[PDB]
């Protein structure tokens, strides 16, 4: 539920594959946009490694490129992406990493800031409307100062 | 009265008559809170006050608590007329006959409004209010 | 909702889980046979009249009771 | 929602695939049945990272079918929905009981009993779409959607949202 | 919904079921095509070899008694009580007429067959306002 009650496989307290703890890992669909294309680009040059022995057109040009590097049955993925670019308004990766620098220097729940990273909010109650869970944990002026930062941080392409 | 206070609760004087029996300025009717609220909440539907079909409006009701509705109409009519004819000359220079006669004319529409004889002069009174309202705007 | 064939009750949500992209209407899990809506607010109206009827019956009773309540006799 | 995660898998090798490039087939079998598939316990496995450091640690032979098997401890990404959070989406399909938001890989259909009262259906629209006091919930419309019921069965999810609260609607 | 199973060949689908039954090894085989369909065919015969519902119909009860590890009190309570749950059924007037004709068909030696029919018809009507009593005897006659 919205009430920051995600399952046990989605608690904060989760283990690495090498048996060791970590805060949960949760992105906005804009940063989570970025890692896939680069990571699947790892696969594709690597697919072509062992084989050695404005934006949206950039977007789908790759979503064919990783398509043909993948098996093809995954048109749904390039749905997920095509959903993103419409609803993923972040670019210029460091900003997003620095956006998080701001969003994490709070000690907020990543689910929230990632959800904050997922949303084109403007103001306090809006943010608290869209996410109830950001209604009271903090003082909204922080949320507010962030939002105008966030609202003009918006990289419009 | 004690036998007609609502379509639902017509006998309400000894049923704790603390809930409000509103006249919609267009109902002139005894509507217990249950029905009047039920109505303006859904909206301007009729208060089913004893076969009534007149629209108990949305939240535009006024307060009239059992004031002899012949008076409630006579009171509701006079104020709007005395507001439509608000100060049409009554103290322009200090006259007592004409102002009082204009006053004697003022509530004569209200007495006609509280009566509505064969209504064709009450309509003429309404045109005077539009003329009075038109004069008020200028 | 319900099903009117195997007569098991249904709803919006459990069944929209069961909607299929090739279908407009919710089939049944059990009989594989589409559903129907179910409820009726009529009973609330039926209950509204009963409270209306009971208050009419109880007014002279609560007239006398309060009238008795003056001296607690 | 989008989270990133560690998942273990127990995969089985029928023995004819004991050519030494099994590992690639392990890396094959892993990839070609993890991407784009689904769980009910973590949702949509969208994609997989760290293909070069793949845990293929150890393996065992089952007393029947003789088939060796392994536990491949691997990190990927997961689409995992919950209830109550707003999320945008562009609709794709309209029917009578509401409309079908293409949310990422999911198509959340919202109910007319989840639409508020201002917005109704004009079937006379083409593409059939919803005309409100202020804006139109078309198919291509980007809508701000909160989740209400998000039914996740193992290998199968479907979800329900409504705009009936504020800063919602067509965007 | 009828909750049924129609048995059918998946590799023929040719026809209503034209198969054969391999009891003695427990399978049904697609007589035409040669494929088994089902397996572990349970005994359907040795089942009964061990051991009045046309009359009594659906109700269940039992004949019971005293034990070796018992005293006459528990003998007596299950003598009186197993008379206390017979009024739940008019079937005392159902059972007893049986017991009546049971006694009687015996007394004049009648075979098993006469009795059962003469039982069976007694289930058939057993009553009507038309019959309305009628002595409870001339009917049994
Ligand atoms: Zn009333
Ligand atoms: Zn009225
Ligand atoms: Zn059914
Ligand atoms: Zn066959």
Please tell me the number of the ligand nearest to residue B8's CA: 1
Interchain proximity C63–B14, CB inside 8 Å: yes
Residue at token pair 């001339």: E138
D68-81 burial by CB neighbour count: b if 16+ within 10 A, else e? bebebbbbbbbbbb
Q: Report resolution (Å) to 1 decimal.
A: 3.4
Experimental method: cryo-EM
Residue in C1, C13, C20 to test binding to D, most D beta-carbons within 10 Å: C13
Interchain proximity B15–C55, CB inside 8 Å: yes
Which phi and psi (to 5°) does residue A63 adopt?
Answer: -70, -5
Which phi and psi (to 5°) does residue D87 adopt?
Answer: -155, 135
| Distance between CA atoms of residues B46 and B94, nearest Å | 46
Please give, one letter per residue, the 3-state secondary structure of E67-99. Answer: CCCCCHHHHHHHHHHHHCCCCCCCHHHHHHHHH
- Burial of residue C59 (number of CB atoms within 10 Å: 0-12, 13-18, 19+): middle
All chains having 3 or more CB pairs closer than 8 angstroms to chain D: A, C
Give the closest residue to A2 by CA, choosing from E6, D81, E33.
D81
- CB-nearest partner of D158 from C12, C17, C24: C17
| Distance between CA atoms of residues E37 and E13, nearest Å | 13
| CB contact set of C13 (below 8 Å; sequence gap of 6+) | D148, D149, D151, D160
Does A102 contact chain D (CB < 8 Å)? no
Nearest CA in chain E to C30: E1
| CB contact set of B70 (below 8 Å; sequence gap of 6+) | B114
Answer for the pair A64, A87: CB distance below 8 angstroms, yes or no: no
Distance B60 CA to ligand 2 centre (A): 12
Please tell me the number of the ligand nearest to residue C34's CA: 3
Neighbours of A143 (CB within 10 A): 23
Tokens of D96: 């009578």
Asked if A touches C (at least 3 Cβ pairs < 8 angstroms), the answer reads no
Please give, one letter per residue, the 3-state secondary structure of chain A. Answer: CCCCCCCHHHCCCEECCCCCEECCCECCCCHHHHHHHHHHHHHHHHHHHHCCCCCHHHHHHHHHHHHHHCCCCCHHHHHHHHHHHHHCCCCCHHHHHHHHHHHHCCCCCHHHHHHHHCCCCCCHHHHHHHCHHHCCCCCHHHHHHHHHHHHHHCCCC
Omega prior to D80 cis, within 30 of 0: no
- Burial of residue A46 (number of CB atoms within 10 Å: 0-12, 13-18, 19+): middle
Does D123 contact chain C (CB < 8 Å)? no
| Distance between CA atoms of residues B45 and B37, nearest Å | 11
| Distance between CA atoms of residues D148 and D152, nearest Å | 13
Does B46 contact chain C (CB < 8 Å)? no
Residue at token pair 């009891």: E23
Interchain proximity D149–C13, CB inside 8 Å: yes
Does D112 contact chain C (CB < 8 Å)? no
Residue at token pair 């919930």: D137
| CB contact set of B21 (below 8 Å; sequence gap of 6+) | B5, B6, B12, B30, B31, B32, B33, B36, B64, B65, B66
| CB contact set of A32 (below 8 Å; sequence gap of 6+) | A84, D2, D4, D77
Please tell me the number of the ligand nearest to residue B32's CA: 1
As annotated, the binding site of E includes: 9, 12, 30, 33
Distance B17 CA to ligand 2 centre (A): 18
Which phi and psi (to 5°) does residue A56 adopt?
Answer: -55, -30
Distance E12 CA to ligand 4 centre (A): 4
Answer for the pair B26, B72: CB distance below 8 angstroms, yes or no: no
Tokens of B47: 């208060």
Give the closest residue to D87 by CA, choosing from D149, D160, D147.
D147
- Judging contacts by C-beta atoms under 8 Å, the chain A residues touching residue D141 are none
Answer for the pair A32, A113: CB distance below 8 angstroms, yes or no: no
| Distance between CA atoms of residues E51 and C66, nearest Å | 78
At D3, which helix (H) or strand (E)? strand D2-13
Chain D nearest-CA distance from C24, in A, is 7
| CB contact set of E46 (below 8 Å; sequence gap of 6+) | none
Distance E39 CA to ligand 4 centre (A): 16
| Distance between CA atoms of residues D111 and D156, nearest Å | 20
- In DSSP terms, D93 is beta-bridged to D100
| Distance between CA atoms of residues E104 and E94, nearest Å | 15
Tokens of E33: 């095509």
Tokens of E138: 């001339």
- Burial of residue D159 (number of CB atoms within 10 Å: 0-12, 13-18, 19+): buried
Distance B23 CA to ligand 2 centre (A): 5
- Burial of residue A99 (number of CB atoms within 10 Å: 0-12, 13-18, 19+): buried
| CB contact set of A128 (below 8 Å; sequence gap of 6+) | A134, A135, A140, A143
Helix (H, G, I), strand (E, B) or coil at D106: strand
DSSP state of D31: H
Residue at token pair 């069976």: E120
Give the closest residue to D144 by CA, choosing from D152, D156, D135, D153.
D135
Does D109 contact chain C (CB < 8 Å)? yes
Please tell me the number of the ligand nearest to residue C1's CA: 3
Q: Give Dmax (Cα) for chain D.
A: 68
DSSP state of D111: E
Residue at token pair 């100062």: A145
Chain E nearest-CA distance from C7, in A, is 10
Residues 110-139 of D with CB under 8 A from A: none
Judged by phi (left if over 0) then psi (alpha if -120 to 50, else beta), residue C42 lies in alpha
| Distance between CA atoms of residues A77 and A82, nearest Å | 8
Answer for the pair B75, B66: CB distance below 8 angstroms, yes or no: no
Give the closest residue to B29 by CA, choosing from B7, B14, B11, B45.
B7
Give the closest residue to C32 by CA, choosing from C54, C67, C8.
C8
Helix (H, G, I), strand (E, B) or coil at D170: strand
- Judging contacts by C-beta atoms under 8 Å, the chain C residues touching residue E1 are 5-6, 30-31, 33
Nearest CA in chain C to E3: C31
Tokens of A48: 């072509």
Please tell me the number of the ligand nearest to residue E9's CA: 4
Answer for the pair E56, E91: CB distance below 8 angstroms, yes or no: yes
Does D47 contact chain A (CB < 8 Å)? yes
Which sign does the torsion angle of CA A24, A27, A32, A35 carry?
negative
Asked if B touches A (at least 3 Cβ pairs < 8 angstroms), the answer reads no
Residue in A2, A38, A78 to test binding to D, most D beta-carbons within 10 Å: A2
Dump the DSSP string for chain B.
Answer: --S-S-SS-S--TTS-TTS--PBPTTT-----HHHHHHHHHH-SEE--TTS--SEE-SS--B--TTS-THHHHHHHHHHHHHHHTSSTTSSSS--SHHHHHHHHHHHHHHHHHHH--SSSHHHHHHHHHHHHHHHHH-
Interchain proximity B14–C56, CB inside 8 Å: no
Chain D nearest-CA distance from A131, in A, is 6
Tokens of E137: 């005897």
CATH class of A27-51+54-157: mainly alpha
Chain B nearest-CA distance from C36, in A, is 28
Name the packing angle between helices A75-87 and A56-69 (round to 10°). Answer: 160
| D48-to-A74, B38, D52, D104, E134 alpha-carbon distances in Å | 13, 59, 11, 17, 89
Distance E27 CA to ligand 4 centre (A): 14
At E102, which helix (H) or strand (E)? helix E91-107
Count CA within 13 A, CB hemisphere, residue C66.
9
């Amino acid at each position: 539920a919205a009430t920051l009650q995600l399952g046990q496989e989605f608690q904060l307290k989760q283990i690495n594959h090498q048996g060791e703890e970590e805060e949960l890992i949760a992105l906005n669909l804009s940063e989570a946009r970025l890692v896939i294309k680069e990571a699947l680009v790892e696969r594709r040059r690597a697919f072509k490694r062992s084989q050695k022995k404005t934006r949206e057109k950039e977007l789908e040009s790759i979503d064919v490129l990783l398509e043909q590097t993948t098996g093809g049955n995954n048109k749904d993925l390039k749905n997920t992406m095509q959903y993103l670019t419409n609803f993923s308004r972040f670019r210029d990766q460091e900003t997003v990493g620095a956006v998080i620098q701001l969003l994490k220097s709070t000690g907020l729940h990543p689910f929230e800031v990632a959800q904050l990273g997922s949303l084109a909010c403007d103001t306090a109650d809006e943010a608290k409307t869209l996410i109830p869970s950001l209604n009271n944990k903090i003082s909204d002026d922080e949320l507010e100062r962030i939002l105008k930062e966030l609202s003009n941080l918006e990289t419009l392409y | 009265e004690n036998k007609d206070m609502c379509p639902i609760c017509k006998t309400d004087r000894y049923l704790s008559p603390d809930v409000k029996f509103l006249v919609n300025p267009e109902c002139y009717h005894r509507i217990c809170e249950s029905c009047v609220d039920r109505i303006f909440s859904l909206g301007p539907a009729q208060c089913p006050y004893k076969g009534c079909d007149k629209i108990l409006r949305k939240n535009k009701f006024k307060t009239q608590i059992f004031d002899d509705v012949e008076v409630e109409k006579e009171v509701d009519i006079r104020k709007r007329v005395f507001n439509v004819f608000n100060k049409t000359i009554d103290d322009f220079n200090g006259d007592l006959v004409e102002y009082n006669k204009y006053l004697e004319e003022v509530e004569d529409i209200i007495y006609k409004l509280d009566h509505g004889i064969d209504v064709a002069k009450t309509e003429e009174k309404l045109r005077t209010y539009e003329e009075l309202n038109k004069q008020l705007i200028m | 909702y319900m099903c009117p064939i195997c007569l098991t009750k249904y709803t919006q949500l459990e069944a929209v889980q069961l909607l299929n992209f090739d279908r407009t209407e919710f089939l049944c899990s059990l009989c594989d046979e589409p559903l129907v809506e179910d409820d009726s607010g009529k009973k609330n109206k039926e209950k509204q009249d009963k409270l209306n009827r009971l208050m009419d019956q109880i007014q002279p009773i609560i007239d006398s009771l309060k009238k008795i309540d003056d001296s607690r006799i | 929602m989008f989270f990133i995660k560690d998942l273990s898998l127990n995969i089985t090798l029928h023995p004819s695939f004991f050519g030494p490039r099994m590992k690639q087939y392990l890396k094959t079998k892993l990839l070609e049945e993890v991407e784009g598939s689904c769980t009910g316990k973590f949702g949509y496995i969208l994609c997989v990272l760290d293909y070069d450091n793949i845990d293929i640690q150890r393996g065992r032979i089952l007393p029947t079918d003789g088939s060796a098997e392994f536990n491949v401890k691997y990190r990927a990404v997961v689409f995992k929905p919950f209830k109550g959070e707003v999320v945008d989406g562009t609709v794709v399909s309209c029917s009578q009981h509401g409309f079908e938001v293409q949310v990422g890989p999911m198509k959340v259909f919202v109910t007319k009993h989840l639409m508020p009262q201002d917005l109704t259906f004009n079937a006379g629209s083409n593409p059939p779409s919803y005309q409100s006091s202020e804006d139109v919930i078309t198919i291509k419309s980007r809508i701000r959607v909160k989740i209400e019921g998000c039914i996740s069965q193992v290998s199968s999810i479907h979800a329900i949202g409504s705009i009936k609260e504020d800063y919602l609607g067509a965007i | 919904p009828n909750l049924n199973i129609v048995l059918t060949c998946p590799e023929c689908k040719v026809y209503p079921p034209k198969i054969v039954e391999r009891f003695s090894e427990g399978d049904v085989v697609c007589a035409l095509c040669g494929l088994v369909l089902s397996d572990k065919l349970v005994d359907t015969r040795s089942e009964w070899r061990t051991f009045n519902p046309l009359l009594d119909g659906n109700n269940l009860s039992t004949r019971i008694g005293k034990g070796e590890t018992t005293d006459m009190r528990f003998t007596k309570e299950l003598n009186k009580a197993q008379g206390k749950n017979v009024m739940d059924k008019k079937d005392n007037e159902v059972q007893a007429a049986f017991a009546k004709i049971t006694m009687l068909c015996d007394a004049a030696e009648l075979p098993k067959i006469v009795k059962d029919c003469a039982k069976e018809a007694y289930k058939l009507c057993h009553d009507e306002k038309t019959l309305k009593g009628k002595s409870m005897e001339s009917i049994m006659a």
